[PDB]
GROMACS .gro file of N, CA, C and O in nm:
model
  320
    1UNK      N    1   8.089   6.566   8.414
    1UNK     CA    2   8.120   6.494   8.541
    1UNK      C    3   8.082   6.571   8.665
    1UNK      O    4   7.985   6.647   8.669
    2UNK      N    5   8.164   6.548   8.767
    2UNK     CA    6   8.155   6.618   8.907
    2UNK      C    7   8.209   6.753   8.864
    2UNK      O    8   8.316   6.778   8.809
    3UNK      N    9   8.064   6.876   8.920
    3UNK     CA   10   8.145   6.980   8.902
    3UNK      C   11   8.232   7.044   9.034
    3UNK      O   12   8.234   7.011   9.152
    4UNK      N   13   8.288   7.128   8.975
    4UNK     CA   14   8.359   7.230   9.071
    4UNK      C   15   8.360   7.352   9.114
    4UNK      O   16   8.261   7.418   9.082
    5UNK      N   17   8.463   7.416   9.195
    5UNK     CA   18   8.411   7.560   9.287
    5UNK      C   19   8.483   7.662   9.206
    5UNK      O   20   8.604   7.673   9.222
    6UNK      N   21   8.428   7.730   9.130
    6UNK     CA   22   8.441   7.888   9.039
    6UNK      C   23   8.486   7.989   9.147
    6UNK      O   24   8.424   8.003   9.252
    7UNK      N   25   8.583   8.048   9.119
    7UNK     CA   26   8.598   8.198   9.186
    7UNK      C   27   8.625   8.259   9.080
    7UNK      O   28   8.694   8.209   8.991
    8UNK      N   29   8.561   8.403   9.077
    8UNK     CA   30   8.590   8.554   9.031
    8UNK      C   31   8.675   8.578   9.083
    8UNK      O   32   8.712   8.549   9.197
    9UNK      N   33   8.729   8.647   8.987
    9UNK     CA   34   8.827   8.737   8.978
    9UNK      C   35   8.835   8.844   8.912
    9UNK      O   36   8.839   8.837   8.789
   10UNK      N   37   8.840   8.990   8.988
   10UNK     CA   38   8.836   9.133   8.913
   10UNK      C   39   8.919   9.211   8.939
   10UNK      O   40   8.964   9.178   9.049
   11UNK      N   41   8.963   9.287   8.906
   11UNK     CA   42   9.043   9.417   8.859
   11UNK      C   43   9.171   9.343   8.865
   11UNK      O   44   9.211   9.320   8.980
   12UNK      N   45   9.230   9.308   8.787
   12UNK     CA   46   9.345   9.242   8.714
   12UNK      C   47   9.429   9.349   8.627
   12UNK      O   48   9.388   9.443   8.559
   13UNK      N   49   9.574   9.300   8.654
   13UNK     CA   50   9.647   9.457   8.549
   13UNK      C   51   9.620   9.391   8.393
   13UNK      O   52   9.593   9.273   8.369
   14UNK      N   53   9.633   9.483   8.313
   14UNK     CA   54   9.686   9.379   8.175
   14UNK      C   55   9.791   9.330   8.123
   14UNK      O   56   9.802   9.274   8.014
   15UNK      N   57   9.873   9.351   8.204
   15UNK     CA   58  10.005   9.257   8.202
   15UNK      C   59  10.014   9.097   8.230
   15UNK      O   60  10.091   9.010   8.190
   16UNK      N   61   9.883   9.096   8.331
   16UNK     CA   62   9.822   8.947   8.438
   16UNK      C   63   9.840   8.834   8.311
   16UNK      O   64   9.806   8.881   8.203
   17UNK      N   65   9.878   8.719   8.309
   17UNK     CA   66   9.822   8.578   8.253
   17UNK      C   67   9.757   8.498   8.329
   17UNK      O   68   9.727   8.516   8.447
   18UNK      N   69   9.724   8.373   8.235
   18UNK     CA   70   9.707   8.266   8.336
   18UNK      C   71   9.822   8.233   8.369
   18UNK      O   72   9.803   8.198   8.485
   19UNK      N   73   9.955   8.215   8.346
   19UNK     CA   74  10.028   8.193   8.421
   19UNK      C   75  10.020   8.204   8.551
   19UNK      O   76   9.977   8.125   8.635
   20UNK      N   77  10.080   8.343   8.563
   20UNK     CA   78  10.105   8.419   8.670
   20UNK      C   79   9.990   8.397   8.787
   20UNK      O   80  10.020   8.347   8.895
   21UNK      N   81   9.818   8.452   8.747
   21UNK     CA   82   9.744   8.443   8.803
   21UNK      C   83   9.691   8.282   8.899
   21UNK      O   84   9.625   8.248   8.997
   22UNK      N   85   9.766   8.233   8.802
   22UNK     CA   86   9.781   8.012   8.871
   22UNK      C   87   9.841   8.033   8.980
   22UNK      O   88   9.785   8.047   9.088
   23UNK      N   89   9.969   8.036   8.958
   23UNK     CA   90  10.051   8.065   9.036
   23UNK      C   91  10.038   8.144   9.175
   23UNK      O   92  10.099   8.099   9.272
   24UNK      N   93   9.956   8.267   9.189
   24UNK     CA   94   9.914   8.367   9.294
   24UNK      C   95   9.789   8.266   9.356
   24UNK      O   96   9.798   8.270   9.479
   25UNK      N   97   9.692   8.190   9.320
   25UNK     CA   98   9.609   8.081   9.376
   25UNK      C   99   9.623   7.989   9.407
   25UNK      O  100   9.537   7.918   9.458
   26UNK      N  101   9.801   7.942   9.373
   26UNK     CA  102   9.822   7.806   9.361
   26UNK      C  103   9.853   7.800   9.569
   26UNK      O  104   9.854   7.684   9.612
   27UNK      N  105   9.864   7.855   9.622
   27UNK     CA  106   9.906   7.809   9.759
   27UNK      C  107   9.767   7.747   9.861
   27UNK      O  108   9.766   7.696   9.973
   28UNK      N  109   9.669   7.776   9.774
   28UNK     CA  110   9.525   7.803   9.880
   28UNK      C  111   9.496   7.628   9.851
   28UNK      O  112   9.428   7.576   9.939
   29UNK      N  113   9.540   7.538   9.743
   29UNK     CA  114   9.484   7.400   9.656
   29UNK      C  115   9.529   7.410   9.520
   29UNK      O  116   9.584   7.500   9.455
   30UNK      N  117   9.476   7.256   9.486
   30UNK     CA  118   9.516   7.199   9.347
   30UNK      C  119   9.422   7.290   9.259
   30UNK      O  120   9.313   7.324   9.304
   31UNK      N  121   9.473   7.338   9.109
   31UNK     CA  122   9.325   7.448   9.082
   31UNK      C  123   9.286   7.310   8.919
   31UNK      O  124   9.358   7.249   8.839
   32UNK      N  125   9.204   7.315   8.933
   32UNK     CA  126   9.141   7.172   8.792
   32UNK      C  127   9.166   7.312   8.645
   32UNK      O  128   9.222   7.290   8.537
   33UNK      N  129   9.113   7.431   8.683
   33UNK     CA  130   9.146   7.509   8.579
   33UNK      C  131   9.136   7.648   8.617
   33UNK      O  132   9.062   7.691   8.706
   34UNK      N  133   9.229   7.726   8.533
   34UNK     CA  134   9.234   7.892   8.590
   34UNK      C  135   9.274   7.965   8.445
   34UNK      O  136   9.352   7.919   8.362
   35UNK      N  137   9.193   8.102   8.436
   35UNK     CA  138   9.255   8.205   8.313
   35UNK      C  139   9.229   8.300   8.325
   35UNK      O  140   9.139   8.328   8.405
   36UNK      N  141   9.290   8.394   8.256
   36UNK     CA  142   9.206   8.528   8.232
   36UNK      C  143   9.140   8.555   8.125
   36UNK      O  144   9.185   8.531   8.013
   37UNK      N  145   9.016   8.613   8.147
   37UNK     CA  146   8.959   8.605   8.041
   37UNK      C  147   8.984   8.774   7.943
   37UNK      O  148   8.954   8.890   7.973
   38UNK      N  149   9.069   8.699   7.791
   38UNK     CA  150   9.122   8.804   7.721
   38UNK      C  151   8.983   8.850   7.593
   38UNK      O  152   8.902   8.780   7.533
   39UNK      N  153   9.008   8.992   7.594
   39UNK     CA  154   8.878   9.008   7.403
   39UNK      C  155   8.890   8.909   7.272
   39UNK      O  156   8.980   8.897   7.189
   40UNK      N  157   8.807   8.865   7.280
   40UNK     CA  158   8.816   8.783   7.142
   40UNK      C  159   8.895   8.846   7.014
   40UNK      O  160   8.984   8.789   6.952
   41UNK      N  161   8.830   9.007   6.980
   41UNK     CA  162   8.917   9.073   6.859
   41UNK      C  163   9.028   9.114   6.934
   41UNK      O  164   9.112   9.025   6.933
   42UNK      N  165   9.059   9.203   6.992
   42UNK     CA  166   9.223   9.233   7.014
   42UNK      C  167   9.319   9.121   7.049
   42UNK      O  168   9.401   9.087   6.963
   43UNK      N  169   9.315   9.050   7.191
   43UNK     CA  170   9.379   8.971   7.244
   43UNK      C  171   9.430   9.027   7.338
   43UNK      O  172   9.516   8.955   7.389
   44UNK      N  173   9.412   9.179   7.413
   44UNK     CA  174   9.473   9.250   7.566
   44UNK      C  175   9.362   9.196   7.659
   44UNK      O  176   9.257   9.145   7.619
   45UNK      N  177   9.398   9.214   7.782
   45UNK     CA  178   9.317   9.181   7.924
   45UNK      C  179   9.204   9.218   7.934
   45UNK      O  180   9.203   9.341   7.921
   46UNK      N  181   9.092   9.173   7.953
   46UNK     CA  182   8.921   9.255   7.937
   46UNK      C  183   8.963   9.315   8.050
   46UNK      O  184   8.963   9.437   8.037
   47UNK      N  185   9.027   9.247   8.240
   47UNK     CA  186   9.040   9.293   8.329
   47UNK      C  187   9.006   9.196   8.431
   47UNK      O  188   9.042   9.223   8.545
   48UNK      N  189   8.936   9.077   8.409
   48UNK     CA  190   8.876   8.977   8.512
   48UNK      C  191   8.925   8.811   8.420
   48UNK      O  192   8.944   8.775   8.304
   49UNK      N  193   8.929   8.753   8.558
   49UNK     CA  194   8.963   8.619   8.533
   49UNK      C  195   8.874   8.489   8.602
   49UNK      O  196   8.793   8.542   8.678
   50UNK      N  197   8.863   8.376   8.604
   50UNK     CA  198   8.858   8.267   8.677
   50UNK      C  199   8.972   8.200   8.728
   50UNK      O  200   9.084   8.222   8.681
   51UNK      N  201   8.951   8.107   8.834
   51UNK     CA  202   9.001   7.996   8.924
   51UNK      C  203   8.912   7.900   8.982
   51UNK      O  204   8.874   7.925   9.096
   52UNK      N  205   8.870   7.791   8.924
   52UNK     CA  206   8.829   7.656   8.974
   52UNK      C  207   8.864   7.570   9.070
   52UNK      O  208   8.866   7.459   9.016
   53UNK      N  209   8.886   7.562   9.160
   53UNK     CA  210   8.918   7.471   9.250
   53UNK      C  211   8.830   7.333   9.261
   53UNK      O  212   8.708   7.339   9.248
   54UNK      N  213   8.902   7.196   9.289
   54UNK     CA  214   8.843   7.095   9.347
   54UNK      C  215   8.733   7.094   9.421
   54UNK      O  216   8.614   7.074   9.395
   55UNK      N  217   8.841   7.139   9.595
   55UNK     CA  218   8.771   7.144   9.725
   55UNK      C  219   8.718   7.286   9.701
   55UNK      O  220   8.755   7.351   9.603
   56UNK      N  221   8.625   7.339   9.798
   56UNK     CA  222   8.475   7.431   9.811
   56UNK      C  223   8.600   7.488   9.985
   56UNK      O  224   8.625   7.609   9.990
   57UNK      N  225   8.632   7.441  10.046
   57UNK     CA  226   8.670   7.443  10.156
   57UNK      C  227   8.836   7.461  10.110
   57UNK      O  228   8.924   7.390  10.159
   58UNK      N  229   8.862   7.573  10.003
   58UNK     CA  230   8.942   7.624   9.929
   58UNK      C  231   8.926   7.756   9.866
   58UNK      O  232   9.000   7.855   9.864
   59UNK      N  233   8.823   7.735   9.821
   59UNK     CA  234   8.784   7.839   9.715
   59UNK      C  235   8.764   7.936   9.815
   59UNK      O  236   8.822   8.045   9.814
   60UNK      N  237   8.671   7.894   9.916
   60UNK     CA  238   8.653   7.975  10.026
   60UNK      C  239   8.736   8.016  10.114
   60UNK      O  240   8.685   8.093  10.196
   61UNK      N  241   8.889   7.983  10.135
   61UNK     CA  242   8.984   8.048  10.165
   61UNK      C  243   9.043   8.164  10.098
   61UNK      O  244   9.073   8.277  10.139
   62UNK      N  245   9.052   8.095   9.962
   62UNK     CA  246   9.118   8.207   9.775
   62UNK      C  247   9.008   8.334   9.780
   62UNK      O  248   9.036   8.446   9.739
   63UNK      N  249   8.917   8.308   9.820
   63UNK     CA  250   8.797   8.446   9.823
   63UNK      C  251   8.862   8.523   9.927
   63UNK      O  252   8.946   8.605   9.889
   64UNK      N  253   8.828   8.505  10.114
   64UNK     CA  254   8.854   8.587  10.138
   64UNK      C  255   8.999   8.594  10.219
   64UNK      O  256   9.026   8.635  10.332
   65UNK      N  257   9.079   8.540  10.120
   65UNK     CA  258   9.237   8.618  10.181
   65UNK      C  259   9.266   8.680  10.044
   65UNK      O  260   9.383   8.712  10.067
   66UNK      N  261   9.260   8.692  10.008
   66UNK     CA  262   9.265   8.781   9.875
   66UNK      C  263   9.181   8.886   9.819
   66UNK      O  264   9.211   8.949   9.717
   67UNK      N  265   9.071   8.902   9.889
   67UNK     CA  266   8.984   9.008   9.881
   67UNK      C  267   9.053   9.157   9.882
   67UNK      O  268   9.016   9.240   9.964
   68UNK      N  269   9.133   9.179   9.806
   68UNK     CA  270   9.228   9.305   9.791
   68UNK      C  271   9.361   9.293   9.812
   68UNK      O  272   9.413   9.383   9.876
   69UNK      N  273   9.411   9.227   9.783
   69UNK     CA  274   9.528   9.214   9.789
   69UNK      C  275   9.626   9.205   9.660
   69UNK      O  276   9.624   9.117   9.574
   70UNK      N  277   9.716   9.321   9.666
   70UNK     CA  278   9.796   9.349   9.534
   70UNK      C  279   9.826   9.217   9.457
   70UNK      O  280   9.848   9.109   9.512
   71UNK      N  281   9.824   9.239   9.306
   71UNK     CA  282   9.856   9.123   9.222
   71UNK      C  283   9.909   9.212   9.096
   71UNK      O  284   9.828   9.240   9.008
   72UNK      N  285  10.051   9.260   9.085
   72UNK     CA  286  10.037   9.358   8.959
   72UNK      C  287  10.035   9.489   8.920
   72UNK      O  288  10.017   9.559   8.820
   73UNK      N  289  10.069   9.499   9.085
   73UNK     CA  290  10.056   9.697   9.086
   73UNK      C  291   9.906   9.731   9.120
   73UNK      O  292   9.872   9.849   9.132
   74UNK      N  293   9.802   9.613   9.139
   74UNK     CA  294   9.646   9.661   9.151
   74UNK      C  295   9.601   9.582   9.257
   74UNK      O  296   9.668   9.487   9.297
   75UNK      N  297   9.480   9.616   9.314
   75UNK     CA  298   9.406   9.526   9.460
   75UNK      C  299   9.317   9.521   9.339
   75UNK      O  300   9.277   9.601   9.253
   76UNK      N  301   9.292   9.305   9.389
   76UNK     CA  302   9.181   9.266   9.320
   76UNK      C  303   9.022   9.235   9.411
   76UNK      O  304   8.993   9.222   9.530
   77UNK      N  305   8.953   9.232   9.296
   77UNK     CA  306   8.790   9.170   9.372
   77UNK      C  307   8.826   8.997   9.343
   77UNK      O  308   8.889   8.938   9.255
   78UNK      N  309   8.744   8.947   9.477
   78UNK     CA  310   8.724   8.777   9.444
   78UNK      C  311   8.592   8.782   9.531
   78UNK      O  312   8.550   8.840   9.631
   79UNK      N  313   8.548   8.682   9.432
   79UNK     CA  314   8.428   8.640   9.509
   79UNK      C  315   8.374   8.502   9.383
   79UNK      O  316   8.436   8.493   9.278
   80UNK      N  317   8.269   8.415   9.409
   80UNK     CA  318   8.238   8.304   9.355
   80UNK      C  319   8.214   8.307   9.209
   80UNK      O  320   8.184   8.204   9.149
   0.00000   0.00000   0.00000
């Protein structure tokens, strides 16, 4: 269908879920889908995640107000 606006997400603790990490994006818009992406063999945090947003004129808020800003005991990277 209609696609949507991807943001990166890096340096994540390994404690992070998608829960949690929804939740920390959820104020910027509606998100269509968000996770972290975990190792296939273990199942701990690789360290980076996604967030999808609808609106583009969102995502681009979630980028740069969050461009370092604690999530977890750590400052993360965002960008597209």
């Amino acid at each position: 269908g209609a696609n949507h606006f991807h943001v990166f997400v890096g340096d994540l603790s390994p404690e992070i879920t998608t829960e949690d990490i929804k939740a920390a994006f959820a104020p910027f818009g509606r998100i269509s889908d968000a996770r972290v992406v975990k190792d296939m063999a273990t199942g701990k945090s690789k360290g980076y995640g996604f967030v999808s947003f609808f609106n583009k004129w969102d995502a681009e808020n979630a980028i740069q107000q969050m461009g370092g800003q604690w999530l977890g005991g750590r400052q993360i990277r965002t960008n597209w």
